[PDB]
Amino acid sequence: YSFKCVNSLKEDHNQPLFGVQFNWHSKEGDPLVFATVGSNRVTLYECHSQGEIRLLQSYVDADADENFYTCAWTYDSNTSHPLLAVAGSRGIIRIINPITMQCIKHYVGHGNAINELKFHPRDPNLLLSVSKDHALRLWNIQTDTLVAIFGGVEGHRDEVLSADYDLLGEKIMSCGMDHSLKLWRINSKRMMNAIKESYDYNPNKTNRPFISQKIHFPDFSTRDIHRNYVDCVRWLGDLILSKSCENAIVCWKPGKMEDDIDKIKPSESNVTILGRFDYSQCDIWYMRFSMDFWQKMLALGNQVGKLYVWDLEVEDPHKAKCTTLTHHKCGAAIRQTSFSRDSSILIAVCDDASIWRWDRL
Ligand SMILES: Cc1cc(-c2cnc(NCc3c(F)ccc4c3CCO4)n3cc(C#N)nc23)n(C)n1
Ligand code: NA
Ligand code: NA
């Protein structure tokens, strides 16, 4: 069963769609749902049979000058109800109730735009934001606390564009405009204690403010993978996938070939390149690749509407199998893609506000 294009639509604001995410927490027996973000809007859609994309409801920011760049799903840890976090150029994180599209609460702190949001893979309350102000921030949305800020002179020296947690949420890799990729361990004694204290914090029961950690030294750093802005990074096991605007996703690891990622010291000067997935016409800034839930597949769109999909179910990264998907009516730049949890549907969103649905048939 290969992917076939079954439907498309266009949002009425005619501005770029910069983010799309399926809700991988959608419940058994419920339709698949994805969110899109662009302009000052967040919109939810349901996937139905015969390729139908059913429009539900939007959240529209009161600031006409807001531009949402990113969204991420989680759930309420006490009720299991789904939640959607969104953020963009205003640097405000909004937690949206996707049922009613009400803004439930918001967080301010970043000195500028937020370029990506990610939830911890094991803890639905821990939200990571990366910002134009050169820092990452880790929030606890259960107690509304800023747990840690990752920055300083040895942190990123320009806008941070992307970050990703590893499998267990023990470490973060970040990347951005300074061409660098940086590792931040969050399973240190200091960070585990900070997370524990954030859960114990209730401003109604104490006089102290909550103290955020300032983490000023990454556990690894390299500028030897890309030669331009690094705008997307993801873990693949202990390996890293990252891209710039140089028509390539590089698969690499810190240290030499046989170096364990958890033995890597901050002074480590070597990296190892395990493969590189080349493609065409994707040389503009701000284009994201995505993986499915099981990390069997990788997808990326290019600036003229072509989709590349790599099968990662092979013995080594450089053996990945590529397929391409095109439609004669899809010619705008694809900023982000999202697989449904089972990988039966792939959605792409574009600079002309169009949405493209591909079904595995
Ligand atoms: C034509 C155009 C493009 C953008 C734009 C998009 N996305 C971001 N950040 C989000 C992001 C990212 F960090 C890395 C990869 C990526 C995404 C969205 C799609 O893949 N942007 C940050 C600034 C600034 N300053 N501009 C943008 N605009 C406003 N207009
Ligand atoms: Na249509
Ligand atoms: Na108090």
Q: How far is CA 189 from CA 166, 170, 192, 193, 194, in A?
A: 18, 11, 5, 6, 9
Cβ(231) – ligand 1 distance below 6 Å: yes
Neighbours of 25 (CB within 10 A): 15
**Cα 187 to ligand 2 centroid, rounded to whole Å:** 47
Cα gap 218→118, rounded to integer Å: 19
Looking from the CA of residue 176, the nearest atom of ligand 1 is 13
Ligand closest to 285 (CA) is 1
- Using DSSP's 3-state secondary structure scheme, residue 336 falls into strand
In which residue are the tokens 């079954």 written? Answer: 6
Q: How far is CA 142 from CA 56, 212, 327, in A?
A: 27, 15, 44
Minimum CA distance residue for ligand 1 atom 22: 115
State the Cα angle at 52 between 37 and 287, rounded to 5°.
30
Cα gap 307→234, rounded to integer Å: 18
Q: Is residue 356 within 8 Å of 8, Cβ to Cβ?
A: yes
DSSP codes joined into one string, 162-191: EEEE-TTSSEEEEEETTS-EEEEES-SHHH
State the Cα angle at 227 between 224 and 230, rounded to 5°.
90
Q: Is residue 202 within 8 Å of 210, Cβ to Cβ?
A: no
Q: Is residue 25 within 8 Å of 73, Cβ to Cβ?
A: yes
Cα gap 143→319, rounded to integer Å: 45
Type of residue at 232: C
Cβ(145) – ligand 1 distance below 6 Å: no
Let me know how many helices (H) and strands (E) the chain has, helices first. 1, 29
Cα gap 286→276, rounded to integer Å: 19
**Cα 144 to ligand 3 centroid, rounded to whole Å:** 14
Cβ(162) – ligand 1 distance below 6 Å: yes
Closest by CA to 234, choosing from 164, 288, 336, is 164
Cβ(156) – ligand 1 distance below 6 Å: no
Looking from the CA of residue 67, the nearest atom of ligand 1 is 29
Closest by CA to 72, choosing from 17, 128, 122, is 128
- Residues, the chain: 361
Minimum CA distance residue for ligand 1 atom 6: 286
Instruction: State which of 15, 69, 178, 181 you would mutate to test the pocket of ligand 1, scoring each by most atoms of that ligand within 8 A of its C-beta.
Output: 69
Instruction: State which of 15, 18, 39 you would mutate to test the pocket of ligand 1, scoring each by most atoms of that ligand within 8 A of its C-beta.
Output: 18
**Cα 62 to ligand 2 centroid, rounded to whole Å:** 29
- Using DSSP's 3-state secondary structure scheme, residue 274 falls into strand
Q: Is residue 108 within 8 Å of 91, Cβ to Cβ?
A: yes
- Bridge partners of 280, per DSSP, are none
Type of residue at 32: L
Cβ(66) – ligand 1 distance below 6 Å: no
Looking from the CA of residue 335, the nearest atom of ligand 1 is 19
Cα gap 181→329, rounded to integer Å: 36
